[PDB]
Amino acid sequence: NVLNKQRDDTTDASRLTPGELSEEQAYIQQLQDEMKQIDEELVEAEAKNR
Amino acid sequence: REVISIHIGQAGIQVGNACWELYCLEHDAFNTFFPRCIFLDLEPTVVDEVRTGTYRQLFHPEQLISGKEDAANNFARGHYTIGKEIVDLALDRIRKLADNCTGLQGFLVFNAVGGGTGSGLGSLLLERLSVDYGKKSKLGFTVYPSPQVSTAVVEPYNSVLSTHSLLEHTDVAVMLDNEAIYDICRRSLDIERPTYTNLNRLIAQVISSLTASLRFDGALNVDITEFQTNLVPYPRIHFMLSSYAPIISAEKAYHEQLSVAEITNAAFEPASMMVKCDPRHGKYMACCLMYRGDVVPKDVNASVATIKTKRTIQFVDWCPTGFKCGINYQPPTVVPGGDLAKVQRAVCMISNSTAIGEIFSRLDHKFDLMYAKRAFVHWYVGEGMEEGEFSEAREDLAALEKDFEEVGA
Amino acid sequence: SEMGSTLTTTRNNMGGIFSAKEQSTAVQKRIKLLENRLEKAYVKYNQSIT
Amino acid sequence: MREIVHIQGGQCGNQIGAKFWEVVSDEHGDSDLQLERINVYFNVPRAILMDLEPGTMDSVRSGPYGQIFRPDNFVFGQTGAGNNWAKGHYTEGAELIDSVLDVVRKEAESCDCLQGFQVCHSLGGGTGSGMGTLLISKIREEYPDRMMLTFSVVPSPKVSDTVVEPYNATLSVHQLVENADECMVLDNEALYDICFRTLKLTTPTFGDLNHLISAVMSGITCCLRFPGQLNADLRKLAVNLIPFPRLHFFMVGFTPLTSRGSQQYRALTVPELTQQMWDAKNMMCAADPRHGRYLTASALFRGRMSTKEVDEQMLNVQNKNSSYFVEWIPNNVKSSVCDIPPKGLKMSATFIGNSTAIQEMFKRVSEQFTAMFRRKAFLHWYTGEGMDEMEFTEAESNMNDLVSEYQQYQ
Amino acid sequence: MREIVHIQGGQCGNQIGAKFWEVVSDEHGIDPTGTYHGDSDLQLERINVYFNEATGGRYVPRAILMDLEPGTMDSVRSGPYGQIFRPDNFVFGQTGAGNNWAKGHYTEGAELIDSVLDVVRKEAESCDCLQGFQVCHSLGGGTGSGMGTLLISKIREEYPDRMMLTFSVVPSPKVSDTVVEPYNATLSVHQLVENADECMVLDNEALYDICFRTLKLTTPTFGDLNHLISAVMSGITCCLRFPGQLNADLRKLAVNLIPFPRLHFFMVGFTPLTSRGSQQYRALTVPELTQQMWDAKNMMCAADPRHGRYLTASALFRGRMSTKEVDEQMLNVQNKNSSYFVEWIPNNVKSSVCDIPPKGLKMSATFIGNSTAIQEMFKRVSEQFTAMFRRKAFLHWYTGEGMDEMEFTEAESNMNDLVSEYQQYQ
Ligand SMILES: Nc1nc2c(ncn2[C@@H]2O[C@H](COP(=O)(O)OP(=O)(O)OP(=O)(O)O)[C@@H](O)[C@H]2O)c(=O)[nH]1
Ligand SMILES: Nc1nc2c(ncn2[C@@H]2O[C@H](COP(=O)(O)OP(=O)(O)O)[C@@H](O)[C@H]2O)c(=O)[nH]1
Ligand SMILES: Nc1nc2c(ncn2[C@@H]2O[C@H](COP(=O)(O)OP(=O)(O)O)[C@@H](O)[C@H]2O)c(=O)[nH]1
Ligand SMILES: [Mg+2]
């Protein structure tokens, strides 16, 4: 009985361990690229105004 | 709108003796109950305790059906030999109860499958009700035998032979053990020496919480036809774990701060299930949450969000919206002499998962061991059965095990 | 004893009970911040254009 | 003269409409301007309640402003749907919709010149969505040349009431894309978020959400009921917002919305209304418009305002956010002004934006629908009632090609 | 016309600003409920610099409160003139920095300053032609130093062509409340040298000695110090709110007072400041105002200018006065004490007059002197910082949160070149 109790707790602990979120990290990466694109886009436009 | 209740056996009508006490104490809203009942048993001892009890005049004399002699923990006796003379009188009354009714939601049956009357003539009553009405719902709240706590010996034979008909006759089947309820009264209610009376009182609380939507007006009402869709994803998978919160004493209740968030949590821990099984081994297929009393839709909405984002429990890969909520305004009532304190709000959760697949597998070995040596089989066969239905009920539960394993994947 | 040892090392590996929700909620909030920042950068660029 | 009849279906529709008739009755009441334009909503209100559970009808007569409906207009079943679209669309509808069509025809011919019909319902429930859907279909083949409005709430995974929400939402939108003239998409997630952020309520019961939806519905029909410096009826807005006949799902916002703690600390000017109107956190749908573009936009204003301020402000919001609008349509914004404000305010506004970010929700539901329908969960409660397999495939196909044309035009 | 939004950070910033809005509202005749009750038209014509009419005579201050603890915000709305601020302007965290500059600049800043910037952006676009921004904070705390510091850097990147004031109290060894004061001071100033347009150096020692000897107070609670600081801040902006014979806006003073772009830390004084035993025995003349103005003990910083030379100096006078007295007084105080003024700039003192005194006084003044003696403070904190850093004491909350070793070395280097370039230009 005590072995089964301990085993369930290990399985719970393994479930809880943080796991990398692929569907979200790639979003962050894509967001930064568009951000950097707009910065370079902005500097050309400021040059045009002067 | 009305719904009538049938009670079979020593366990059935004692559960009813507490359930109807709560209904009269709780009460146009009464129209769904006022009683539209029938007690029936083979032993006259427990029915005739009602006939002389405090509720002598409350029940019409004919209602209380009673046979001549008991089936004696014998499914075959209570299904083939003695059932055949009393079941016809019972259902030929229940018909005129339905003719009294106009908007019948359904029937609800109370039985314990360990015995002969609760199991045998339970299934027999169910088979003639299914061919007579078909479409009308029949909610069966049954009491299955516990794994380690047990009172009889031949109950594995009864439980398998009863289940074979409980599959395709009842619509919504709620399991309830005795060890799990004993643990509930020991853990939360801190009653170290409980009897059957305390068990039956909190069983009535669950029943009342799922019919209060018909009786009283809430923010989000839910009928008996609603459970029919929202919790059974397959026509032969209807077996529901039950839970309730807050099951709490009279002093602890005032000390603690009962709210919606924590009771939604407490209704999900395996320390509060009405059936001895661990849903950590299983995956939730669907959940249903009846909220009574002082509930706004926001915090119930917020509570189901936290459950979904936790990882201690998991859902099937099929249901992103794996819940069905329901809110009613009137708070739960209390019974003098009862142990549950008055609460502004309570939650009765009815779920469906694959943890139930463990109880059947656990049941199989005990039945299998006895059957292999042909223990006690001579009692049932001389009653009118054969070796055919023993083996065929066995393979029916084998199919059910593979079914749960297939759907759970 | 061996199962107990595996339990303790897995317990240390999860980095705590509350760890998973914090990392999950932090990356979600990070998503929101980049979205907010991207809007302001777009506004500046479009204002420059006019 | 120009007439709008009201239909309320299901529990959601009935309680929303009860609040709706409270605010309209209070709006029409000192002034003689109130008496001249009550034929549009009165003859007793020109409304028809419709449900299957008597608790909602009793709940309607119990509350105040519940004794003003004509009891003959309480057309009403008895058995109940049970969140089953097949029950709401094939079994229970088949004997109650004939009765609703009797009463709706009587309420339509009672007036001289109909402008249109106005339906308030849901897309997750059975007797609200399905029956109201069938009702809409019966109305479309009888009166094709009349206007039609459907304020429909759409379910979100964050506000997940029932288990079969996707099975009902997908089927319901399959009928809306052909039957209704236009629809105003609502949801409970955005409504709850709005009462948190802007309204700052601690206990937002349904009364508040239904009060918010009611303010929108009162705002869209103010031009008929009151004189204005620039009038825009329902047909005028429809042609200015709908570029293609199937692209008629809108997002709505109402202004001004401030907490009772800050009501006296704020100013009420047209620039101040426009900042809150175009705020992405102020849409009453869970579709972030900055995830796409605007096809067109419309702003209905109420109160004595300078029209020049209206036009120059709308031009500004189009020049500043120049990437969020469609290219082959310059001047994407339609505007209108009426001189009578709602009771308790000086100056109000109503935003209707036809954006292409709404395709997120339709795609957002399809993955739940495809999740269930892949392995046939909950399917028999729909199949054994009369529906077949090809209906779900058809419903899925229309969802997919719909998000494609938003994606196409985006 | 020209508009200045107000930004208060941390506990010190919040309490300083509370007394500021009380004093200002009294000058314009707005009661604590937020309605107008003045008499002269001169009060109603220039309240757009600091307020917005909301609805029906409701004037709300154009201010933004920002910190990390709830106690300060609650202490604002409790006291009078606490009900005048718009509740949306209470941008507000919950966890706290704990006098850890990294937590105020890297850990907790990342989740609040975006929200702070939304309110600040709304207050900038709510007005037409910004004159500048006004930030009140400390240099020894965490939530005032780090939070306000990162805010200043981001703001200068958004609106670069606009003025900016930072009223900052600095720590000193004698008044030492926190233990990590040098770590906070040197890093905070390292950011101020490259972000702020001009900064006003304050410290608590001078405030204590003003209330000891000049004011002759017995129990000087923080309400009186904040009362003193508010009079100085109202003086720097009286030119925008009231007409006069010689107006001087913020831009006019900064371009005139700052000879080199990195040398923009000022010493402040205020006149008149008199005790209740001597408020009757005095006169009110321009020369009487001038000597009490240029007094060494009357500086509102504990850095004696008579240890060095003045680079530039400014005077803002308020009240009906004769401009000849203004100009001749500045000329005389420069001719007798000729060695105390820098040589390669003639007429090192710019002066201006405004025709509206503070309520309750006939004639006041405000002094803004950019002297070279300020390097004492930079060395006084620099050696304490180097003393701590050469053994890495208190470093693990800094290096464990995101700073590296080169940041402190960068701080020392920038510290050392500023005190060296002060030494050259003197
Ligand atoms: N919860 C609960 N269970 C009961 C109660 N009484 C009996 N049981 C259960 O009933 C099972 C046996 O069936 P009984 O109801 O006692 O007897 P029966 O079903 O009428 O069958 P017969 O003995 O042949 O008449 C036992 O396993 C008990 O767990 C009760 O009062 N409350
Ligand atoms: N805003 C609002 N939404 C409601 C209200 N009542 C129900 N709903 C929504 O309606 C959905 C359930 O609709 P349902 O009652 O099943 O409709 P019906 O069964 O067809 O009448 C839920 O998602 C609720 O969020 C209400 O009073 N206000
Ligand atoms: N003038 C004044 N200074 C104060 C007050 N309260 C704190 N201080 C100064 O603030 C310094 C400590 O900064 P702290 O209040 O912790 O700043 P914060 O935590 O960033 O808000 C000390 O050197 C005090 O002299 C006040 O009410 N008035
Ligand atoms: Mg018995």
CSV table of N, CA, C and O and ligand atoms in Angstrom, one decimal, chain B residues 9-11 43 70 72-73 115-118, ligand 4:
chain,number,residue,atom,x,y,z
B,9,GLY,N,-35.8,-2.2,-1.8
B,9,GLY,CA,-34.9,-2.9,-0.9
B,9,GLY,C,-34.7,-2.3,0.4
B,9,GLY,O,-35.2,-1.2,0.7
B,10,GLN,N,-33.9,-3.0,1.2
B,10,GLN,CA,-33.6,-2.5,2.6
B,10,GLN,C,-32.8,-1.2,2.5
B,10,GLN,O,-33.0,-0.3,3.3
B,11,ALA,N,-31.9,-1.1,1.5
B,11,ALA,CA,-31.1,0.1,1.4
B,11,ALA,C,-31.9,1.2,0.7
B,11,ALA,O,-31.8,2.4,1.0
B,43,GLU,N,-39.1,-8.3,2.1
B,43,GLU,CA,-39.2,-8.4,3.5
B,43,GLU,C,-40.1,-7.3,4.1
B,43,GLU,O,-39.8,-6.1,3.8
B,70,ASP,N,-38.5,-12.7,1.9
B,70,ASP,CA,-37.4,-12.0,1.3
B,70,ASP,C,-36.7,-12.9,0.3
B,70,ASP,O,-36.7,-14.2,0.3
B,72,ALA,N,-33.4,-12.9,0.1
B,72,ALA,CA,-32.3,-13.4,0.9
B,72,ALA,C,-31.0,-13.4,0.1
B,72,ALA,O,-30.3,-14.4,-0.1
B,73,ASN,N,-30.5,-12.2,-0.2
B,73,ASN,CA,-29.2,-12.0,-0.9
B,73,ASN,C,-29.0,-12.9,-2.0
B,73,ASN,O,-28.0,-13.6,-2.2
B,115,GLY,N,-27.6,-6.7,-2.6
B,115,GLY,CA,-28.6,-7.6,-2.1
B,115,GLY,C,-29.3,-8.3,-3.3
B,115,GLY,O,-29.0,-8.2,-4.5
B,116,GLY,N,-30.4,-9.0,-2.9
B,116,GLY,CA,-31.2,-9.7,-4.0
B,116,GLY,C,-32.4,-8.8,-4.4
B,116,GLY,O,-32.7,-8.8,-5.6
B,117,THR,N,-33.1,-8.2,-3.5
B,117,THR,CA,-34.2,-7.3,-3.9
B,117,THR,C,-33.7,-6.1,-4.6
B,117,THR,O,-34.3,-5.7,-5.6
B,118,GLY,N,-32.7,-5.4,-4.0
B,118,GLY,CA,-32.2,-4.2,-4.7
B,118,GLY,C,-31.6,-4.5,-6.0
B,118,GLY,O,-31.7,-3.6,-6.9
F,4,MG,MG,-32.9,-6.9,1.9
